[PDB]
């Protein structure tokens, strides 16, 4: 009358695991031919009394996702026209179309020589560039010689104007044998034993918005402003702040752009900026002044909760370096905007119908990722572009020291790309299902 | 009386299904070095009293054939020398030979600047081209400026002289879990029940013959001419006529053409017609006149059953469009022919040896599959060639609309590559095997 | 009494079968991301009472290794800068820096018109070339009109200096359902039964060493020198000789080269030898003389067991062809050496410190294998190259017959890659596991 081994199959047991995930949908760079529609009825367990500890920054789903994004960008860019043939000496002069003082030096007009439909023939041609797309190549020879910024490094590629960069949300789905755990704790600290967990087969959709200093168009915190950091005393690491109210931002490139097209080679079309008509004004973004101040007050109080009381907090501008890190960056319509944050991070805090305008600059030749293996040229956009978006979170860093609970200074970060999604995927964990278990009893 | 449920596994149950098929091998475009070995002994199994209803035009096997053929052309074409380096201004003069009346203006002697093995040495070269391959740039001035017709669109690419275009038949095979149903009925016109069926694992081989107006080298009807269409009253549809008697056609290019070649670059070579030995004459095809007349009369005999009686039936030439929809196009020896069919579709039939010679045109720069993303240069063929082939069927277009609903007139059509394959795929359907089923009984 | 058919599953039965193998490592050419982590436990299991016949030269593990090296080289070279913009003529003269009469005219001082980052600018540049890399034009006015030797074939490609070509060993692993059976018999040559065997899931690592005459860094024979051949009576097959005495060989390129680089196109970097600091010296390899004599004497003792006794044996050098089949071709440090081994094969054997110095040639443009549809360049190496390797075996051929079938003579040659790897893979056989079988017994 001893005990014996009994085998049970179909046991509800989890193991931490890393596997691949499927792409699921609700031309376009992400919503591609090899991504499938989801089933819109998640089979949740409605929070049974299961407690599970998990965290951010160690969730390798992020890394897989990051790699997929890079792959999608390259796949859509491979069958596109090389702009290599355009790496020629350029001749720039001053642009003369009623440019205001604030815009002097922003645009340059170059003439150049280029190939065309027939190999032995070359046609003089001209185009308009933003100053940031070119460099001066020789004061000694004269004062008009320029080249495109990336002609001395990997080739610049552009075509496929028909492909959308609209951030269509993508869902991730588990393979059979796997499941995704989901945290419903709206007070979750980013690392702890989430008491409110469920299971899904697919995550909700996440918009692949790529940005630097401010996170746009993400999930909104539902109850309160929250803060996430791997280590609060680590001043090398970034701090993620999720807002519980959106900040509405109105951006524009208020200039009417004519788009021109020429052929470089055999069906090798090139699109470029033609005349800009009307006068020339600076690109910019507006935020409600009142809402921004309200937003910061909430952020400051939340920061204080992780510091002592009456901590004096300051906001300030970035350290410089590449424009990508220096400024806020986003894409809209295929256009690339680099915006100053001087009107956003300036004020200080104490223990006790207007707007903010941020000037913006435009770039066309961009090293999209942190690697310099390739380069992409943005197509021009015909007409006038206006964009409206929601700030859902901030990326801040602490200065490398503060003194005696004062002048605690935060500045825009955005140095990593991965936190653009860590901020969305923090609610999920991936586990393997291990249906085979053993538990003893008394039987024949 | 109280009966229970049993489960049967290995149940003979069918479901319609959409899956893919394999390949058949026993180089060229289709029966490639990466093609599945064929089945030396497929087993056809007659099914006692199975009647199966199926439809042509709902048969996805056609679409699979289409996509595979396109893929195979691209795989074959990809590792070829591009002819972009030859997209130069051509200085054109006449042909110093005995030119017949119908060949004057058909050929031009083009000279040009060409590259050599080293990028500092350039030479003058010349080649003969067909008129359809060459376009006038500036008729005003120069009176000598010409280029290849597709140098202002996607590049013309083609070399790979070692690869044949022989339409080697490919057998399609189903994966395990699937079966192919073959219809043995000899009256059915593709929309309805088939009282005599059998199943196979693999189909017989199907030859991917390129065609337009006339269907060459297809399987022949065994008992009667069958005219098949999606909707008889819909004049926007193509009409497939499958003959029960072959009509022999003999084509020639009676010109002892000599192939010359140049080295363009680093292992980059191009072949073209240089000298022509003997007189220059137009390519042509012969169709037995007597056979055609009787054969067409048989088609008419059947049209009189599909349509009403005492209707005069007429045949006429197509109305227009580019060469690819006005001529009978076919491949022979890797070369592409575009033959006039006016001597064939010219008759009136009422209810109450010799030969047809068809003049042909030659096009070397080809925009195959109506795809505008690429073009190919068929290589020249050394010497005089002959083509012998069988006419198995026709694609007709009924001219819809008539005062008092009389005198039906038909014109050749067939401007869809998918409609050629219908002639062999119409006999097959793909089925998923469903081995599980449930039925009632007396057990407990 | 009567025995019934019975079924046993889990039966230890082998079949001779061919499948592919998994790559496991120990970036590089071979140790790429597409390779499995090192087997932590090469759990070898010796088999009692098992004898199997392992005929090598039937062993298709060789063919799989052959295909893998070719594919890996292509994957590594694929993204590298091409040398097509360098296929121009050059103005060459004799470079001078205290060059002896033996090397006189071997190294050239050449100039050419280079493309710069901007395609519309050209400059004159200098670099050094070895005579074996370049060819002249005789009749076209003057001799200083050199071109690279392979600009008449597939583009010469090479860059990616960061990639290591060090022959890091790779392990092969069986797929599930398969096992690798290893021969433990130290006396085993390549044919017939092996009385002592064991199995593994993974083999030890094998270094992908490329060689034409002297097999370098390989498995050593442990008891005796072993002579292996598919056929030991004809003169059609190569003779594979494994030594049991490693022979140390010291190779050098005694030239303190300086490396210079340019940009030709968009990040399209090119590297070349610039000057040489200090005077120029002849490349060579040093073999201990006594060791070599002992080595050959041991080979002779073994030849006498396949051949008769009291036979005079003579050695001679390769009959000729390109350097790849005439010299000892090997790579070290990325440099390609072509060493004259006649000094190793200029002696006779009879019926009953002091070094050997072998002069070497250096080549930069290579074709890797025996295919001529590809060409590669080689980077210059900065500084002096000193290499130390172990001669593990010889690839020998026998001369095609002799008077009275006496005085046998031998020569190095037959340097096919396939025959090098035979010396490492002869120990292994791959079999399939067939767990199911029938063995009748008494039952109901």
């Amino acid at each position: 009358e001893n005990l014996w081994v009994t085998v049970y199959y179909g046991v509800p047991v989890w193991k931490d695991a890393e596997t691949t995930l499927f792409c699921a949908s609700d031309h376009n760079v992400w919503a591609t031919h090899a991504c499938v529609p989801t089933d819109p009825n998640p089979q949740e367990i409605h929070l049974e009394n299961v407690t599970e500890e998990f965290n951010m920054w160690k969730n390798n789903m992020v890394e897989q996702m990051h790699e997929d994004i890079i792959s999608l960008w390259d796949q859509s860019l491979k069958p596109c026209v090389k702009l290599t043939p355009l790496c020629v000496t350029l001749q720039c002069t001053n642009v003369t179309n009623n440019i205001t003082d604030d815009m002097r030096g922003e645009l340059k007009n170059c003439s150049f020589n280029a190939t065309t439909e027939l190999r032995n023939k070359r046609v003089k041609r001209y185009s308009l560039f933003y100053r940031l797309d070119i460099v001066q190549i020789d004061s000694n020879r004269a004062k008009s010689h320029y080249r495109l910024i990336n002609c001395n490094t990997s080739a610049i590629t552009q075509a496929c104007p028909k492909v959308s960069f609209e951030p269509i949300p993508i869902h991730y789905c588990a393979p059979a044998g796997f499941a995704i755990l989901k945290c419903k704790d709206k007070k979750f600290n980013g690392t702890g034993p989430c008491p409110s967990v469920s299971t899904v087969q697919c995550t909700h959709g996440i918009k692949p918005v790529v940005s630097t200093q401010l996170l746009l168009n993400g999930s909104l915190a539902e109850e309160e402003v929250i803060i996430r950091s791997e280590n609060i005393t680590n001043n090398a690491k970034n701090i993620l702040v999720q807002l519980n109210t959106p900040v509405q931002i109105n951006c524009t490139r208020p200039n009417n752009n004519t788009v021109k097209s020429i052929r470089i080679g055999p069906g090798q079309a090139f699109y470029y900026t033609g005349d800009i008509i009307g006068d020339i004004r600076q690109a910019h973004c507006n935020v409600s002044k009142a809402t921004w101040n309200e937003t910061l007050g909430k952020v400051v109080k939340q920061l204080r909760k992780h510091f002592g009381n009456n901590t004096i907090i300051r906001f300030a501008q970035s350290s410089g370096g590449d424009l990508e890190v220096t400024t806020h960056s986003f894409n809209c319509g295929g256009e690339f905007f680099y915006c100053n944050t001087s009107g956003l991070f300036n004020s200080t805090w104490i223990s006790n119908n207007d707007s903010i305008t941020l000037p913006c600059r435009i770039k066309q030749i961009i090293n999209m990722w942190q690697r310099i293996g390739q380069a992409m040229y943005a197509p021009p956009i015909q007409g006038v572009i206006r964009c409206v978006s929601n700030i859902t979170g901030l990326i801040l860093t602490r200065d490398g020291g503060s003194t005696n609970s004062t002048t605690e200074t935060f500045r825009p970060g955005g140095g990593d790309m991965r936190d653009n999604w860590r901020s969305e995927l923090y609610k999920y964990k991936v586990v393997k299902i291990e249906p085979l278990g053993v538990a003893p009893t008394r039987c024949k | 009386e109280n009966l229970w449920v049993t489960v049967y596994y290995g149940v003979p149950v069918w479901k319609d299904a959409e899956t893919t098929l394999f390949c058949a091998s026993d180089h060229n475009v289709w029966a490639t070095h990466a093609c599945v070995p064929t089945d030396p002994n497929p087993q056809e199994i007659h099914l006692e009293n199975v009647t199966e209803e199926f439809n042509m035009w709902k048969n996805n096997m056609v679409e699979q054939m289409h996509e595979d053929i396109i893929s195979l052309w691209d795989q074959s074409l990809k590792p070829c020398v591009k002819l972009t380096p030859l997209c130069v201004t051509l200085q054109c003069t006449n042909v110093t030979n005995n030119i017949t009346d119908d060949m004057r203006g058909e050929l031009k002697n083009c000279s040009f600047n060409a590259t050599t093995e080293l990028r500092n040495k350039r030479v003058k070269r010349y080649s003969l081209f067909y008129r359809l391959d060459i376009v006038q740039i500036d008729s005003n001035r120069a009176k000598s400026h010409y280029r290849l017709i597709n140098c202002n669109t996607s590049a013309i690419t083609q070399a790979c002289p070692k690869v044949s275009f022989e339409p080697i038949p490919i057998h399609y095979c189903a994966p395990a879990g699937f079966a192919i149903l073959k219809c043995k009925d000899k009256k059915f016109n593709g929309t309805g029940p088939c009282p005599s069926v059998s199943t196979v694992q693999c189909t017989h081989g199907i030859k991917p013959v390129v065609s337009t107006q006339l269907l060459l080298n297809g399987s022949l009807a065994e008992e009667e001419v069958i005219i098949r269409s999606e909707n008889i009253t819909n004049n926007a549809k193509n009409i497939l006529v499958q003959l029960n008697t072959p009509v022999q056609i003999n084509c020639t290019r009676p010109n002892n053409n000599t192939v010359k070649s140049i080295r363009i670059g680093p292992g980059q070579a191009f072949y073209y017609t240089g000298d022509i030995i003997g007189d220059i004459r137009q390519a042509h095809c012969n169709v037995s006149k007597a056979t055609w007349n009787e054969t067409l009369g048989k088609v008419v005999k059947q049209l009189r059953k599909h349509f009403g009686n005492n209707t005069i039936i007429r045949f006429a030439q197509s109305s227009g469009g580019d060469l690819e929809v006005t001529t009978h196009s076919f491949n022979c020896g890797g070369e592409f022919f575009y033959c006039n069919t006016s001597g064939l579709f010219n008759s009136t039939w009422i209810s109450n040896n010799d030969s047809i010679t068809l003049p042909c045109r030659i096009k070397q720069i080809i925009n195959m599959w109506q795809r505008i993303g690429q073009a190919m240069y068929a290589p020249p063929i050394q010497g005089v060639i002959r083509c012998v082939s069988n006419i198995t069927g026709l694609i007709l277009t009924r001219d819809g609309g008539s005062t008092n609903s009389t005198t039906e007139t038909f014109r050749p059509g067939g401007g869809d590559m998918r409609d050629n394959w219908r002639s062999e795929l119409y006999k097959y359907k793909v089925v998923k095997i469903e081995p599980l089923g449930v039925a009632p009984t007396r057990c407990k | 009494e009567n025995l019934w058919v019975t079924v046993y599953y889990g039966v230890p039965v082998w079949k001779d079968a061919e499948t592919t193998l998994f790559c496991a490592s120990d970036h590089n050419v071979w140790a790429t991301h597409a390779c499995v982590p090192t087997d932590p436990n090469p759990q070898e299991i010796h088999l009692e009472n098992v004898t199997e016949e392992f005929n090598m030269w039937k062993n298709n593990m060789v063919e799989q290794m052959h295909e893998d090296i070719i594919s890996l080289w292509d994957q590594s070279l694929k993204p590298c800068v091409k040398l097509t913009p360098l296929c121009v003529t050059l103005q060459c003269t004799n470079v001078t820096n205290n060059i002896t009469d033996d090397m006189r005219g071997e190294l050239k001082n050449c100039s050419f018109n280079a493309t710069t980052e901007l395609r519309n600018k050209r400059v004159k540049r200098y670099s050094l070339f070895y005579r074996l890399d370049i060819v002249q034009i005789d009749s076209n006015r003057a001799k200083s009109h050199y071109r690279l030797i392979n600009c008449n074939t597939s583009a010469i490609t090479q860059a990616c200096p960061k990639v290591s070509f060090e022959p890091i060993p790779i392990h092969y692993c069986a797929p599930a359902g398969f096992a690798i059976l290893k021969c433990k018999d130290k006396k085993f040559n390549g044919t017939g039964p092996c009385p002592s065997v064991s199995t593994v899931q993974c083999t030890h690592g094998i270094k992908p060493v490329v060689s034409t005459q002297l097999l370098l860094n390989g498995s050593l024979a442990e008891e005796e020198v072993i002579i292996r051949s598919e056929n030991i009576t004809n003169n059609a097959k190569n003779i594979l000789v494994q030594l049991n005495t490693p022979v140390q060989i010291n190779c050098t390129r005694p030239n303190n080269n300086t490396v210079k680089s340019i940009r030709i196109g968009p990040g399209q970097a090119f590297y070349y030898t610039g000057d040489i600091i200090g005077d120029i010296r002849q490349a060579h390899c040093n073999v201990s003389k006594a060791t070599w004599n002992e080595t050959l004497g041991k080979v002779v003792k073994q030849l006498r067991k396949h051949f008769g006794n009291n036979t005079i044996i003579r050695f001679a050098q390769s009959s000729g062809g390109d350097l790849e089949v005439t010299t000892h071709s090997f790579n070290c440090g990325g440099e390609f050496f072509y060493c004259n081994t006649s000094g190793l094969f200029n002696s006779t054997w009879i019926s009953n410190n002091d070094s050997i110095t072998l002069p070497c040639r250096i080549k930069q443009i290579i074709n890797m294998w025996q295919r001529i549809g590809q060409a590669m360049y080689a980077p210059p190496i900065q500084g002096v190259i000193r290499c130390v390797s172990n001669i593990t075996g010889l690839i020998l051929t026998r001369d095609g017959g002799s008077t009275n079938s006496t005085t046998e003579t031998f020569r190095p040659g037959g340097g096919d890659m396939r025959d090098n790897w035979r010396s490492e893979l002869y120990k292994y056989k791959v079999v399939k596991i067939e767990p199911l079988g029938v063995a009748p017994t008494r039952c109901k």
């Epitope: 020589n113 032995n120 023939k121 070359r122 046609v123 003089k124 041609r125 001209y126 | 500092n120 350039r122 500036d138 005003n140 001035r141 120069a142 | 519309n120 050209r122």
Partner: antibody, heavy 136, light 109 residues
């Protein structure tokens, strides 16, 4: 390959006159053009030159303020508008083409904007001339 | 304004004669844009030499030319009756205008 002048009428002093060169047989629109005049018994005097877009117009000082050069790329026609004609302006006026073409440099032909030819700096094609007379 | 050129030149048939023309920095000592024309009376002029010594297609090899400093020179070797035409020198100037010389009458006797 012809330049045909017309409009060589007779006017009173101080009156205007329009000449027109009916160019034909060449891509007129791709070539620069000139007007030259020669009074009876006198040598050749240059009057004016015009570019494809007209972006460049130069005149002899002697005709400045009295002569305007213009053109029609499509009608293949060159024009000269004379104003306030002086007795001294009586001359045979000629239409002449500026030579030029592509520039064969560094292996590849180079062309101006809209594929216009560049200038080789010497007149090549000449017309026949027409006579412009100021009466007295 | 005009280039200096002799009113007339002369020589016997079959002889080589040259016609000089003098400009300034803004011609021959400023550009190679220096040309010569032959004008048979009653006709528009035709180009004989351009680019100092260039030969238009159709012009005989007995016609040549040179420059030195600000002086241009047209060479007519082997004078014939067909050469009794006015000769003109001209230049594309700095100022992008065309300057002509006075015109030389050649008599062959």
């Amino acid at each position: 390959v012809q330049l045909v002048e017309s409009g060589g009428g007779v006017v009173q002093p101080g009156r205007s006159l329009r000449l027109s060169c009916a160019a034909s047989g060449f891509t007129f629109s791709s070539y620069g053009m000139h007007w030259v005049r020669q009074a009876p018994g006198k040598g050749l005097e240059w009057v004016a030159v015009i570019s494809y877009d007209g972006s460049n117009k130069y005149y002899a000082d002697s005709v400045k303020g009295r002569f305007t050069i213009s053109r029609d790329n499509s009608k293949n026609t060159l024009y000269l508008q004379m104003n306030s004609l002086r007795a001294e302006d009586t001359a045979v006026y000629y239409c002449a083409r500026e030579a030029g073409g592509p520039d064969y440099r560094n292996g590849y032909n180079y062309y101006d904007f809209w594929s216009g030819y560049y200038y080789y700096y010497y007149m090549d094609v000449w017309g026949k001339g027409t006579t412009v007379t100021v009466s007295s | 304004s005009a280039l200096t050129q002799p009113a007339s030149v002369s020589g016997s048939p079959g002889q080589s004669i040259t016609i000089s023309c003098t400009g300034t920095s803004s011609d021959v000592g400023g550009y190679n844009y220096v040309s010569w024309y032959q004008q048979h009376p009653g006709k528009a002029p035709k180009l004989m030499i351009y680019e100092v010594s260039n030969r238009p297609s159709g012009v005989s090899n007995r016609f040549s030319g040179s420059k030195s400093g600000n002086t241009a020179s047209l060479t007519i070797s082997g004078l014939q009756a067909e050469d009794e035409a006015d000769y003109y020198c001209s230049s594309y100037t700095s100022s992008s205008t065309v300057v002509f010389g006075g015109g030389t009458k050649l008599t062959v006797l």
